[PDB]
């Protein structure tokens, strides 16, 4: 099994998983190939051949069950720990060796480390020590036992600390040692050791520019002392240096409020983060970190809120961040963070308009569309929250780059409680969510006098059920908003009017009687909405108006509410429109009330001089008194 290795490490065209079909031969293929590897890994080849080799070895390694065929691999891997380009592949290989016979892998590793220490003690140069600390950092999170034993030993500390002190400008050794310290901070005993014995050294190397970032990354893992780290990450990110390490750090650290206030305080860094997010060059992993930072820093508390709105307006809105984000390629996690950003920005109603102009509504809708049959998780909910807030404060038809705002409606309906015969919604929405959904729906229902939304409601019986199920909600604001929604939907008969005004249908006639009672709701906004339902339909659909004119409970209730509450202007107007439509359609209804003297003198009081923008009050009082006159003469 010789030539297979040559074609495996010969060029990137061939693949190992490819020629895995030519392998097989478990008695011979694995053994023979391992002998080829052993003779071949006896030297260091260029980065391409080595990358092929350590991409391929893990497979074979995972297979071969005879441990004495995988011995040499420990030396081969540890002796390449300084080779950066193939370091993670080595890790993978070691992990594969670790997956089966873990203990023997770690044992051979410890033995090789001890020989490396002896070689390092006899080296007039630092090259053996570099190798040793690179091997230690490479295998530390998998061989934690032997690595902790090495790091903690006086013999290893002696040579390490001494050569560090002596060779402060051996950048490869210092850097290897700082990466070692960071990685090794995983274990607790090592962390205590580092935090008891290295603070002097770390303060020292923190003063040296070319080691500042790596030293800060060690210090993170162990107030003023922290503040200096954060200022380092911020300044070095704003410069442009070590985008990867700094963004990772700050994405973690912006989980703390003080870090956030500092970041928002530093202008240059904010411009830099926005420009990096826009920059077509930064890696997708850095883009993700940048977005995590932006979402953390833009989040409203539940730091001073005004600082957060100032930051969001200055750097996210005015730098057209949302308009750009529409165009960058986003993973699902990055899209999640962008939804977070949009949500945060909309916590300040004054910005929603601008957000929508930059395309945020579109991003919300696409996000929901793609998650619809996929992941109704917390980001789904968050997206619906942002969308509801959007639709409460903007004109709907100019809100999704000329896409249909009505496409939001199915998503809004997911924050309405389903009829309680209808499963559990994956969405953990609250009463506030339901309230805001109904506000947004009420806004959608203004389009084309409610026909568009009503047609969406009629295509799915569930939607109308979830509305009707809020007619008697115990929360005043939900009941109020429901009635406002229904009254907007009653600007066009379509067929939704049958829900209340098809008297041949028992269910509808019952809903009618309920509505008549709702005319006397204590909440004046609810009352206005109920009145507008009746007034809209009666002034707009003459068939229904003829039927309503015969419904004595409605007429008596409307008159009672007019007698006792006519000093509210919207309510008075709507009751007058209802009553006059009814009376014009039915002289026998007029004859019914011709002797209600209190009704007559309330009507006369307004036939005089209504205030405000109110021609209808005198006009309609005049009409009604005229009909009563008709009946008395």
Numbering used by the authors: 1 to 222, 230 to 309, 335 to 665
Which sentences from the paper describe this structure?
In addition to functioning as a folding factor of the myosin motor, UNC-45 can form linear protein chains that provide regular spaced docking sites for HSP70 and HSP90. Structural analysis of a minimal chaperone:substrate complex reveals that UNC-45 binds to a conserved FX3HY motif in the myosin motor domain.
Given the difficulties in obtaining a co-crystal structure with C. elegans UNC-45, we moved to the less complex fungal orthologue SHE4.
